[PDB]
Design a protein around this ligand. Structure first.
Ligand SMILES: O=S(=O)(O)C[C@@H](O)CO
Ligand SMILES: O=S(=O)(O)C[C@@H](O)CO
Lengths: 186, 186
């Protein structure tokens, strides 16, 4: 029952069972920075790009939250990582709302920024394109059905072209015990 | 002087103290292939591109030579390596025939292919652009006068943005003793 839990149920009732939106901000300002730092150590470009996101993306306090911070708009939302799979945007964004499995909505203005600003930058630069291009012929057959590698064979499937990395647990205790001033001083 | 050497002097007289031409075919057919193999092992891409040059470039027998083969047009000529310094072409090709030091002439039809088909592929891709981009600030002072690194400070000058490599002596004896079928067979 909801006795004593008016705040959490107020937040949850507003979002429970809505269709999530595609938020473009992280991808947008990540791309904006990465575009200007090509050639530099990758993690240095990355850090610069996250600083650009930190400075420019919308900040949020979810209405009624005791916690501050989101990484996209109100409601249910997801965010984008074109460094992985931006070569799919052209084929896939059109029918995200209609996807039988796990549909998402996207505002026309977000589709416009995505296809005019973001996706054109990542052409020839995504991880997925690189992997598909260089896969040895002896391996292609069990990996991808098609020449662009947009369709898995579902025999020996690669899984690195839909995520950045395996799961991860950062050292949260270190951040709260020291704070980032002290880590930065190190 | 010229007794007994009619052949070499016929050849040499036709070209002595003539103005060398820019020939573009090596660059053109090199670029044409490198454009299609991005992401692959560099020396594999390089070999595909050299095969494209071998299949498509004009072959020549200099008139009256006993030796077959040039890598450019009749007369005195040079060829192009946009992989090094293609970011200079916009600024330098204009002033080439009137360059105080080491002038070169270029057919306007070759110059158009150069500046419309070749040079644009190499934007953001050249060695020189990469070096200039990443050089630590502590070191730019003595290396480059300008932000784009097109002018040496002539204090501590890098020399790798105007040549592919140091001098080199290939093992010619091995080529003539074995042939490339037997080397390919190894
Ligand atoms: O270990 S991973 O392959 O990164 C993910 C798995 O733990 C969750 O699906
Ligand atoms: O050794 S290098 O610096 O490649 C060239 C020098 O031999 C002068 O041509």
């Amino acid at each position: 029952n909801r006795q004593g839990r008016e705040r959490v149920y107020k937040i949850l009732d507003r979002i429970q069972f809505t269709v999530p939106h595609v938020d473009i901000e992280r991808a947008r300002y990540f791309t904006e920075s990465m575009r200007q730092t090509e050639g530099e150590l990758l993690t240095l470009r990355w850090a610069k790009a996250l600083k650009n996101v930190a400075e420019k993306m919308t900040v949020y306090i979810t209405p009624d939250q005791l916690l501050a911070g989101r990484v996209g708009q109100l409601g249910r939302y997801g965010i984008l990582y074109p460094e992985i799979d931006g070569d799919f945007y052209i084929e896939v964004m059109k029918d995200l709302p209609n996807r039988e499995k796990s549909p998402f909505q996207i505002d026309p203005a977000a589709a416009a920024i995505l296809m005019e600003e973001i996706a054109p930058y990542w052409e020839g630069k995504t991880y997925h394109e690189h992997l598909n291009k260089v896969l040895p012929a002896e391996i292609r057959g069990v990996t991808y059905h098609d020449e662009r590698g947009l369709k898995s064979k579902f025999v020996v499937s690669e899984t690195s072209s839909y995520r950045s990395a395996l799961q991860w647990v950062p050292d949260y205790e270190k951040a709260m015990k020291r704070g980032f001033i002290d880590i930065q001083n190190e």
